[PDB]
């Protein structure tokens, strides 16, 4: 009777849309210091964000653009957040993918895009060489911090100004 | 400045959902003869359909199940309609894919799932050997109709009863 047989998501769409609209209101009213975000256009699932390099960090003076993409499975799956602007950082690769716990295994539906951006700012201030996406940058941070920071400042001026 | 850069659909979701709900009401009130359809569950994009073999056809007495899947691009892209129940028919393959003009290049957004099902019934009554998906069945229809129809009746009894 298996022999008789030959060989997008309504509910999740409704829940994700409800959450995203709430988060938009929240981040507009109470944005994280140095960061803004909102829809690029008519599609509520695709946002842009601007982050200013944190004061005192090697990224100070930079203006960085991020793409934030929600799936219909939001908030049960994390948003996809990538840097569009090139940045020299051991946790952020050439595709702009960010190694941040809460964007992967440590995501919880209770987290907000405001909390995610705050966390990304914290990562720009204090990188995490224990979990790098760019090995050479992480080893350089550990072994030749002066060169690391010179390069990070140079890339900030070159690509983020 | 391209050098500065690193290397689901709100609007369509709203339009597709509006259309699908209207079509559901229509097909419930005024179903095509010998056919029924509606959502399998909570997801409005995934429907089931039952088609009875058309009277007088070699499929008479069969009860056939179809999967109908809408995309967020509906009605601008056609629904995906496949037979779940095995059927011996030159326009319907072993994956249940149906060779019907209106399901591919001849789709228009004005067409309804009621019109699609009517068309599928017409195809079960009058197959189209000019555009087959199963070559051997089409050639057999042309050259040995008696064997074709014997086999179609046998497969109806075996898999659709």
Alpha carbons A138 and A90: distance in angstroms, whole number: 5
Helix (H, G, I), strand (E, B) or coil at B95: coil
Q: Which two tokens stand for residue B66?
A: 């179809």
At A33, list the tokens.
């210091």
Longest Cα separation, chain A: 70
The number of folded domains in chain A is: 1
Bridge partners, B97 (sequence order): B82
A153: tokens are 């400042």
Q: Is A99 a catalytic residue?
A: yes
Contact status, residue B50 vs residue B67, Cβ threshold 8 Å: no
**Sign of the alpha-carbon dihedral angle for B84, B88, B93, B94:** positive
Query: β-strands B35-39, B46-52: how paired?
Result: antiparallel
Domain assignment of residue B38, given as a range:
1-161
The beta strand positions in B62-119, using DSSP E, are 63-69, 80-83
**Size of chain B, expressed as the number of residues it contains:** 161
Closest CA to B23 of B82, B67, B68: B68
Nearest-CA residue of chain B relative to A46? Answer: B8
Q: Which residues are bridge partners to A47 per DSSP?
A: A39, A68
Tokens read off for A72 = 């219909």
H or E stretch at B43: none
Chain discontinuities in chain B, listed by preceding residue (C to N exceeding 2.5 Å): 7
Q: For B7, name the nearest residue in chain A, comparing CA atoms only.
A: A95
Structure tokens at B20: 């699908």
Method of determination is: X-ray
Cβ–Cβ gap A11/B42 under 8 Å: yes
Enter the tokens of residue B133: 């998906």
A128 alpha carbon, distance to own chain's centre: 15
Instruction: Report the C-alpha gap between B130 and A65 in whole angstroms.
Output: 55
Contact B4 A86 (CB under 8 A): yes
Residue A35 tokens, joined: 């960061």
- Could you write out the three-class secondary structure of chain A? CHHHECCCCHHHHHHHHHHHHHHHHHHHHCCCCCEEEEECCCCCCEEEEEEECCCCCCCCCCEEEEEEECCCCCCCCCCEEEECECCCECCECCCCEECCHHHCCCCCCCCCHHHHHHHHHHHHHCCCCCCCCCHHHHHHHHHCHHHHHHHHHHHHHHHCC
At A119, give phi and psi (nearest 5°). Answer: -65, -40
Instruction: Report the alpha-carbon distance of residue A100 to residue A111 in Å, rounded.
Output: 13
Within 8 A of A43 by CB-CB distance, chain B residues are 9-11
- C-beta atoms of B45 and A83 within 8 A: no
Q: Please indicate whether, in this complex, the C-beta atoms of A83 and B6 are within 8 angstroms of each other.
A: yes
The token duo for A55 is: 């004061």
CB–CB of B43/A11 below 8 Å? yes
3-state class (DSSP) for residue B4: helix
Using the structure block, give the residue that is written with the tokens 């960061």. Answer: A35
CATH number at residue A145: 3.10.110.10
Residue written as token pair 């509910």: A11
A160 and B4: CB-CB below 8 Å?
yes
Number of H helices, E strands in chain B: 4, 4
The gap from C-alpha A84 to its chain's centroid, in whole angstroms, comes to: 10
Residues of A with CB under 8 A from a CB of B: 3-11, 13, 17, 42-45, 71-72, 82-86, 94-96, 158-160
> Is A69 in contact with A80 (CB distance < 8 Å)?
yes
- Kindly list the residues from chain B whose CB atom is less than 8 angstroms away from the CB atom of residue A9: 43, 45
Q: Is B155 helix (H, G, I), strand (E, B) or coil?
A: helix
């Amino acid at each position: 009777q298996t022999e008789k047989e030959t060989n997008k998501n309504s509910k999740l769409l409704s829940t994700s849309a409800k959450r995203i609209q709430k988060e938009l209101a929240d981040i507009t009213l109470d944005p994280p210091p140095n960061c803004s975000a909102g829809p690029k256009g008519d599609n509520i699932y695709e946002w842009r964000s601007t982050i200013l390099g944190p004061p005192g960090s090697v990224y100070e003076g930079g203006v960085f653009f991020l793409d934030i993409t929600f799936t219909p499975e939001y908030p049960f799956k994390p948003p996809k957040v990538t840097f569009r602007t090139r940045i020299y950082h051991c946790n952020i690769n050439s595709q702009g993918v960010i190694c941040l716990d809460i964007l992967k295994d440590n995501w919880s539906p209770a987290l907000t895009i405001s909390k995610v951006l705050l966390s990304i700012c914290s990562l720009l201030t204090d990188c995490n060489p224990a979990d790098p996406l760019v090995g050479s940058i992480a080893t350089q941070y550990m072994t030749n911090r002066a060169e690391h920071d010179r390069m990070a400042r140079q890339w900030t001026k070159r690509y983020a100004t």
